[PDB]
Each structure stands twice: as C-alpha cells, then as structure tokens.
C-alpha cells in the first residue's frame, strides 16, 4: 500500500533559533508529495539515508542494524517501565521480534535511559549522519483514518546518539502477546526554504526542487512571487557514457625489469632510462606490493593508471634507510 | 569517548614527557578557554618516522590503511617515547600494523578484519600464497633500534564544534551575571562583546542559542540557570565636528 506525504516530515535542521526569517537549508528531508509505503508480522525494511515514520500504545520500540544476527552491533530502542532504554548490544534476534530479542547481551558499547514518549498520530524521523543517530518526533491529533493529514507541522528534535554504527535495515516492534498500521517514507538530500515566524516555529516550507514555482520561491527567498519572468537554474544535458580512444600501440614498458634488476648502480652514478612509446600497467606494479616507501608528489599515487604523459624518466640507485 | 569533564589541558601540556604535541585548528595553549561538546580519545602505538603521517592531508601505510585524519581536523595529536615500556628484550613483535586493503580508509574509519588480501585474480582459500598476502605485519621494536624506529605511543584527541550543547569546558570558574551593561562575555565558548538584556524569545527546551541574519549571535541560554539573554551590540556611531573655521 502507498499513501501521500503532502507537507509533513520537516524537522529543525540546525537547532539554532531563528525568527521572522526565510532560511534556505540543504539536508535530508522527505520530498513533498512523495509516495510513502503504508504497512498494516512485520517486514524487513531498508534504512538507506534516513527514515520518516508515522503511526496511529501498540507500537513500542524500533530495531536498526546491518545483519540483525548478533554478528554486528544493532541499535535497539524499547519503551519499558515508563523509562525508555536504548542499547547497541549484539543481541541475537528472532525471526519476528515482539523479551526474547534481548538475549546474548555482550559486547555492549553504549547504553542510555531516557524519559517516556508515546485519534493522534506519532511522527518520528531517524537520521544517521557522521556517526550521529538523530531522532525527532511529534504527536498530533487526527480525525481522519483514510489518509495522512494535510497540513504543515515541524518535528521537534528529541535526542542525538553518538553510536556510529553502519545501519542498513530496520524493523518496527509490536506489543508481545488484523493489526495496527504505520507509514514509512525515505529521505532525500533536497533543499528546503523554511519560514520561521516570530515565536520560532516553522509555519511553512518550500521544496527547492519539486516544481518550477517552488524553484522560484526558493531562488527568490519568498513565498509569493509577483508576475514576471524569473530564472531559477540551468539546463545541461548529462553525458550518457564514457568512451576511451587510444593509439593501437601495444608495446610494454621496461618498468618490470627496472625494479627487478639484479645489479644496481651506486647512488653517485644513478641510472637514468628514458621511457616513451609504450603502454605501462601500473596495476601490476601496485599489486606486486613489496615496497617500504611509496610517496608521489604532484600527482595522486592511486590515479597514475588513468592519465597519459609525454615521457617518463626513470632514475635508480641504492641508499641506506635513514 | 570523554564528556562532562573539566578538561585541564594546561596541566597536560606543560609536562616535558610528551615528545610531540601538534594541534590543528586549535592553538595548543588556548585550549583551556574553550568548551567542547564531546572529545574522542584515540590511542595506539606506531614507529617513530610514522608519527609524521598522523596529520591531516598525509599519505602512507598508516595514514591510508590504519588511521586517517580528515582534511579539516580540529584537535590535537600527542605522541611520546614508549621504548622502555612496550619494547622487550629480544625484540617486541606483538604490535601489528596493516599494509593492504581494497580501498583507502575514510577519515576515522576502523578496519580490524584479518581476511587474506587478494592482490591478484587467483582466489585465496584462507591460506597465504601467490598474490595472496597476509594483511598485517609486526613491528620489529628492539632496544638497539635508532630513535627513528623506536616505538611511540600516540593519543589523538578529536574535538567537535557543532551547533549543539557543550559539555566539556576548561575549568574557568563561573562568575556573576550583570545585565544592562556593556560587557565582554564568554558563554560556554561563545565569545563576544555586547550588552546583555532580558528577552521574551521562548526558546524550545532543546535550543541553546539564537542567531541573527548576520554572522552574530542574537540570544543565548545561560548555563546553571537556563535563562534567556538577548545580546545587543554596545551603542556606537560616527563623530562629526562642526567648526566655523
């Protein structure tokens, strides 16, 4: 099932207060008028770049991880005894999580206890950036079960955990004992222009890439655009494929022998060879790894295999370590 | 991870035991006048002529495949001679360093796998062979090694400075607050000059300071008392002289 997202999923992007101002920001937001998957047993969901969650006290806690098999650390949020518990232990998980899930609690590297949260929907946003797992949420009244409310409401932040675990998949948790329902959307690095009112709450927002009118609203840093002609961006057709054209030359470069030469000249009489008109496979040179010092100046060492030079002079000698 | 402490870097610095104390984006001696959200302390042992590679923008085996510092690192790298403690008679071969990896580490990445590095096409069935190298090699620390090769313990303190609440602050004693006077303030590492007044901006419980259009803070939350102070620049203006001649 799919639902429409409309103008929900906006969160305070920088936690610094602003007032009566239109602020343009680049961050992970849920693009407007996008389709969000509606689930109504629980599936395994991809996490990608962040998740928007909505639900309408049946649904408690969430599970995040990469493999979900006690081989890697997995974020667990549970609402028990009115004190919410967050842990990152290598629990061994069940096929369908519902207390069993918290067994084999070893290699624990983070534990946190916080105060409890959760006709009203409960919106959450989970974002994992540079090791910080940021969780935002708000509760709001509803009297329409057929869809997701139309309107605008900014999601107040709750906490930010320095877990730093590579998260790829997540799952919701049901109360252990025809079911409940939730909506999940996926966040994208879109640019948003947010209106801060006198009190400091976001009352409106415009997606800078959703529509040409929204592009003007973003470029003009205004929510009303008077009649006229406006330029917002630039059309440039992107390349379709890469093509490489090189001479038919198949000669191999002397490099092989030069490194492997048995008798080397003395440092005072360093040997110089001029090398041109030959293909040179630096990947064999690299994967022949027995070197103790490899430092290149004025070129990147990792990208010597993608250029073309007029000629290479090879000097060689033997010296002491220091 | 260290946080919620009064980090007294002034005591730590003035000890002559440390052989390398290099800070980037922060001067090594002013650190005691700033407050930090969270400080990461990394520790390890390397050889002497490799400490030079524990710096931003550097290259080499340890920088590329063991410990990579970001281009815009803001913090300190500390190192000192461990030759007496870590090096044992007959050579200390217990400390290992990785030479091979499929790609270079991203900044602060950790890779502790021990799988054999396949450098060629032939698959490695779990035992080293041709084009199949063990990814680690041990340091040959010996008491007779030249200083350049003697071991060095290294601790890298990383400081984060985001728009977030500060917790680790240098131990500068707190003082009383004066309102309606032109003062030079320092609120948990935010410095400036201005007049402090009451404000009616209802910050939400999670916000610490408010910003103006320009590159200036307009309001701040004082610690200990959580009160909201508006900061308005002290009155100034040009002076003109009227003279008949």
């Amino acid at each position, epitope marked *: 099932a799919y639902t429409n997202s409309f103008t929900r999923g906006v969160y305070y992007p920088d936690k610094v207060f602003r007032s009566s101002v239109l602020h343009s920001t680049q961050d992970l937001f849920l693009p407007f008028f996008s389709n969000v998957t509606w689930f109504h047993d629980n599936p395994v969901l991809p996490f990608n770049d962040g998740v928007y969650f909505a639900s309408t006290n049946i649904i408690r806690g969430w599970i995040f991880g990469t493999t979900l098999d006690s081989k890697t650390q997995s974020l667990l949020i549970v609402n028990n005894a009115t004190n919410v518990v967050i842990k990152v232990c290598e629990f061994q998980f069940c096929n369908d999580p519902f207390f069993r899930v918290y067994s084999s609690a070893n290699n624990c590297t983070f534990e946190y206890v916080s105060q409890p949260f959760l006709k009203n929907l409960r919106e959450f946003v989970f974002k994992n950036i540079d090791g910080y797992f940021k969780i935002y949420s708000k509760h709001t009244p509803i009297n329409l079960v057929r869809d997701l409310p139309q309107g605008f409401s900014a999601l107040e932040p709750l906490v930010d955990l320095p877990i730093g675990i590579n998260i790829t998949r997540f799952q919701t948790l049901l109360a252990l004992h025809g079911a409940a329902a939730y909506y999940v959307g996926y966040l994208q690095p879109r640019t948003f222009l947010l209106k801060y009112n006198e009190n400091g709450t976001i009352t409106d927002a415009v997606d800078c890439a959703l529509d040409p009118l929204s592009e003007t609203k973003c470029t003009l840093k205004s929510f009303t655009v008077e009649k006229g002609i406006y330029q917002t961006s630039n059309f440039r057709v992107q390349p379709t494929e890469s093509i490489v054209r090189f001479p038919n030359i198949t000669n191999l470069c002397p490099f092989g022998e030069v490194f492997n030469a048995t008798r080397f000249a003395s440092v005072y009489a360093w040997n110089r060879k001029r090398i041109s008109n030959c293909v040179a496979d630096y990947s064999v040179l690299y994967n022949s*790894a*027995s070197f103790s010092t490899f430092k290149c100046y004025g070129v990147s060492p990792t990208k010597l295999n993608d250029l073309c030079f007029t000629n290479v002079y090879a000097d060689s000698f033997v010296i002491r370590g220091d | 991870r260290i946080s919620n402490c009064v980090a007294d870097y002034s005591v730590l610095y003035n000890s002559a035991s440390f052989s390398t104390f290099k800070c980037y984006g922060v001067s090594p001696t002013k650190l005691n006048d700033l407050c930090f959200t969270n400080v990461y302390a990394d520790s390890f042992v390397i050889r002497g002529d490799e400490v030079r590679q524990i710096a931003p923008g550097q290259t080499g085996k340890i920088a590329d495949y063991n410990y990579k510092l970001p281009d815009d690192f803001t913090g300190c790298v500390i190192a000192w001679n461990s030759n007496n403690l870590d090096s044992k008679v*007959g*050579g200390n*071969y*217990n400390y*290992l360093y990785r*030479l*091979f990896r499929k790609s270079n580490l991203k900044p602060f990445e950790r890779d502790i796998s*021990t799988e054999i590095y396949q450098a060629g096409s*032939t698959p*490695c*069935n*779990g*035992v*080293e*062979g*041709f084009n*199949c*190298y*063990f990814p*680690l*090699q*041990s340091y*040959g620390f010996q008491p007779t090694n030249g200083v350049g090769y003697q071991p060095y313990r290294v601790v890298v303190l990383s400081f984060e400075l985001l728009h977030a609440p500060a917790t680790v602050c240098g131990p500068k004693k707190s003082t009383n607050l004066v309102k309606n006077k032109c003062v030079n303030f320092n609120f948990n590492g935010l410095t400036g000059t201005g007049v402090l007044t009451e404000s009616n901006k209802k910050f939400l419980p999670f916000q610490q300071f408010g910003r103006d259009i320009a590159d200036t803070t307009d309001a701040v939350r004082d610690p200990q008392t959580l009160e909201i102070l508006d900061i308005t620049p002290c009155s100034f203006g040009g002076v003109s002289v009227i003279t008949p001649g």
Partner: antibody, heavy 124, light 106 residues
Framework: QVQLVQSGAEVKKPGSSVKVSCKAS????????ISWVRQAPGQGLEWMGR????????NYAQKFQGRVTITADKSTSTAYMELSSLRSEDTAVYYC??????????????????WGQGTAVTVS | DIQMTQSPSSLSASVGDRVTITCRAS??????LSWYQQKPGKAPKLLIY???SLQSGVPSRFSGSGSGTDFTLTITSLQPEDFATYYC?????????FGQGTKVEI
C-alpha cells in the same frame, strides 16, 4: 638457533583424543607461524595447516577440518594440537615447524627452516 | 589441488656421484618451491628456498636451478650423510601438498 621440541610418543584407542605439544627453545615466536605436518608409517609428508599465535588464527586442510584443533600460547611460545574422534588411519608422526606469513619475508615463500623431532601417535 | 611430480622416484648412487632431482608442477607456480632432506627417524632439513637461493647452514655441495614449472636440485659430491630422502614443496596455494618422496639407496 630457535629449535622446536615436541612431546613424546602417544598410544591411544580409536575414538579418544590426543594432545601433542611443541615448545620453542632458544627463541620465541617472533613473527613466525607454527605449521603441522603429518607422516604415515612408511609414507611421505602431509601438510595439514598452520597457526599464527599472535592473532590466534588457525587454518587447516579441508580433509581434516572439524575434528582437528591447533592452539598456541604466544607468551610461553608453546603450541598444542588436539585431535578427537581418533580412527585407526590417524596413526602417524606429527611435526611442528617454524614458517612465515609476513609480506616482508616474501623471498622465503613460506618455507620451514627448523623442524621439531616429531611425535608418533598410534591409534589401535 | 596442484599436481606436483618428482623424478626420479628412486635412485642408487655411490659416494662421489653427481645427483640431479627434478620437480615439476602441473601449472606455473613461479618460484614457490622449497627443498628438504630427510633421514630415517629424523625431521627434514630445509636446503633450498625461492627455487634458487641457498639456505643458511646448508653445505655448498647442494645447488638449485630451473625455470617456469620445472626446477632441479643438484648434489655435486654425494657424502655418507647425504643418503636420505629429498622432497620438493610448492606453496602456491592451499593445501601445500607434499610429494610421495624419492628414496636414495646406497
């Protein structure tokens, strides 16, 4: 010169387990692996696997995997070989040998330069 | 599994004889060859590594040569203590299979 001294011969019934030891003398496991080699009566040499004590890494030949375990103590430089589910075909001489694994020793190509005296294990 | 063949399977020789033993792999394995001499009731002794390098502590009467797949060990002056078994070993991939051996009798 680093030498390997192995435990004495052992006679054990089929189905039991055997524990062979290998001690370094005049040296330590200074960046060296401990390999195990098998030799049936009147037969040649059979390579089974090797252990890197430094990391506790153990590798074994497919043939034996499952009932064979090699462990090592780096502090005392003593390795021990524990074999279970003994069958009559397990009667043989077992040798421990110093080998290489570090890239820096690429010119040795994982050769073994010092060998223990061997331990005969008879299953009957 | 790399198929490795020794030759000859056995030989008889007297003190002073010139001995040449060949070892061929079923496919190219570069220089991943080690040579061992073994006496009855004793462990083998490493003689030649890297196909051509002379091992420390080995008498200079032993020498190694060969290229590609076929490599040979030569004994210039057979001695009373040289009556023993000679093994070549490949280390290209796991397992590091050993040959059936070559028995040298007087």
């Amino acid at each position: 010169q680093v030498q390997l001294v192995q435990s004495g011969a052992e006679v054990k019934k089929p189905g039991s387990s055997v524990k062979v030891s290998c001690k370094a003398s005049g040296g330590t496991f200074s960046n060296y692996a401990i390999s195990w080699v098998r030799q049936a009566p009147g037969q040649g040499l059979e390579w089974m696997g090797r252990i890197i004590p430094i990391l506790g890494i153990a590798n074994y030949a497919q043939k034996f995997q499952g009932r064979v375990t090699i462990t090592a103590d780096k502090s005392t430089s003593t390795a021990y070989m524990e074999l279970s589910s003994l069958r009559s075909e397990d009667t043989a001489v077992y040798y421990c040998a110093r080998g290489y694994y570090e890239a820096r020793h690429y010119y040795y190509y994982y050769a073994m330069d010092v060998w223990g005296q061997g331990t005969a294990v008879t299953v009957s | 599994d790399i198929q490795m063949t020794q030759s000859p399977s056995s030989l008889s020789a007297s003190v002073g004889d010139r001995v040449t033993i060949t070892c061929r792999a079923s496919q190219s394995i570069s220089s991943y060859l080690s040579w061992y001499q073994q006496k009855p009731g004793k462990a083998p002794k490493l003689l030649i590594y890297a196909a051509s390098s002379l091992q420390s502590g080995v008498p200079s009467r032993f020498s190694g040569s060969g290229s590609g797949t076929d490599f040979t060990l030569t004994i210039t002056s057979l001695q009373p203590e040289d009556f023993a078994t000679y093994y070549c070993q490949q280390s290209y991939s796991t397992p590091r299979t050993f040959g059936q051996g070559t028995k040298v009798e007087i």
